[PDB]
Scaffold this motif. Structure first.
Motif, PDB file in Angstrom:
ATOM      1  N   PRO A  55      80.164 -28.771  -8.464  1.00 34.80           N
ATOM      2  CA  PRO A  55      81.437 -27.625  -7.777  1.00 34.80           C
ATOM      3  C   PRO A  55      81.414 -28.849  -7.099  1.00 34.80           C
ATOM      4  O   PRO A  55      81.457 -30.235  -6.779  1.00 34.80           O
ATOM      5  CB  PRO A  55      80.337 -27.394  -6.463  1.00 34.80           C
ATOM      6  N   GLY A  56      83.070 -28.375  -7.780  1.00 36.26           N
ATOM      7  CA  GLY A  56      83.743 -30.239  -7.088  1.00 36.26           C
ATOM      8  C   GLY A  56      85.055 -30.156  -7.854  1.00 36.26           C
ATOM      9  O   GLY A  56      85.945 -30.543  -8.096  1.00 36.26           O
ATOM     10  N   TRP A  57      83.989 -30.299  -9.638  1.00 35.11           N
ATOM     11  CA  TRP A  57      84.726 -30.836 -10.334  1.00 35.11           C
ATOM     12  C   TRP A  57      86.178 -30.188 -10.499  1.00 35.11           C
ATOM     13  O   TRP A  57      87.113 -28.388 -10.464  1.00 35.11           O
ATOM     14  CB  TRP A  57      84.115 -30.273 -11.333  1.00 35.11           C
ATOM     15  N   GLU A  58      87.209 -30.891 -10.835  1.00 38.84           N
ATOM     16  CA  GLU A  58      88.659 -30.041 -11.439  1.00 38.84           C
ATOM     17  C   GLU A  58      89.451 -30.240 -13.127  1.00 38.84           C
ATOM     18  O   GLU A  58      88.387 -30.908 -14.073  1.00 38.84           O
ATOM     19  CB  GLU A  58      89.901 -29.825 -10.508  1.00 38.84           C
ATOM     20  N   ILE A  59      90.489 -30.863 -13.029  1.00 40.29           N
ATOM     21  CA  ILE A  59      91.588 -30.652 -14.114  1.00 40.29           C
ATOM     22  C   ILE A  59      92.631 -31.723 -13.581  1.00 40.29           C
ATOM     23  O   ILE A  59      93.580 -30.259 -13.076  1.00 40.29           O
ATOM     24  CB  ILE A  59      91.343 -30.142 -14.989  1.00 40.29           C
ATOM     25  N   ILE A  60      93.520 -32.718 -14.196  1.00 38.23           N
ATOM     26  CA  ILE A  60      94.460 -33.172 -13.827  1.00 38.23           C
ATOM     27  C   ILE A  60      94.814 -33.732 -14.732  1.00 38.23           C
ATOM     28  O   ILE A  60      93.942 -34.436 -15.892  1.00 38.23           O
ATOM     29  CB  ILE A  60      94.720 -33.717 -12.136  1.00 38.23           C
ATOM     30  N   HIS A  61      96.045 -35.116 -14.002  1.00 40.45           N
ATOM     31  CA  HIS A  61      96.175 -36.049 -15.375  1.00 40.45           C
ATOM     32  C   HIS A  61      96.253 -37.335 -15.227  1.00 40.45           C
ATOM     33  O   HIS A  61      96.629 -37.752 -14.534  1.00 40.45           O
ATOM     34  CB  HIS A  61      98.076 -35.992 -15.822  1.00 40.45           C
ATOM     35  N   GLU A  62      95.242 -38.211 -16.252  1.00 39.56           N
ATOM     36  CA  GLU A  62      95.378 -39.736 -15.408  1.00 39.56           C
ATOM     37  C   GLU A  62      96.533 -40.580 -16.331  1.00 39.56           C
ATOM     38  O   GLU A  62      97.396 -40.900 -15.508  1.00 39.56           O
ATOM     39  CB  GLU A  62      94.052 -40.098 -16.566  1.00 39.56           C
ATOM     40  N   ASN A  63      97.388 -40.079 -17.642  1.00 40.18           N
ATOM     41  CA  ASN A  63      97.501 -41.741 -17.971  1.00 40.18           C
ATOM     42  C   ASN A  63      98.339 -39.936 -19.385  1.00 40.18           C
ATOM     43  O   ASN A  63      99.268 -40.748 -19.720  1.00 40.18           O
ATOM     44  CB  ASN A  63      97.124 -42.410 -18.872  1.00 40.18           C
ATOM     45  N   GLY A  64      98.658 -39.300 -19.460  1.00 35.33           N
ATOM     46  CA  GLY A  64      99.384 -38.717 -19.880  1.00 35.33           C
ATOM     47  C   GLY A  64      98.453 -36.780 -20.371  1.00 35.33           C
ATOM     48  O   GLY A  64      98.846 -35.982 -20.847  1.00 35.33           O
TER      49      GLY A  64
END
Length: 27
Positions: free
Chosen positions: A1-10
């Protein structure tokens, strides 16, 4: 729980603030 998904360097990587974790794929 809490895990997500975004952008780091591209690229979209898995995120986590509840436990302060990061990755690109599950265990």
């Amino acid at each position: 729980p809490g895990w997500e998904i975004i952008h780091e360097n591209g690229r979209p990587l898995y995120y986590n603030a509840e436990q302060k974790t990061k990755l690109h794929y599950p265990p």
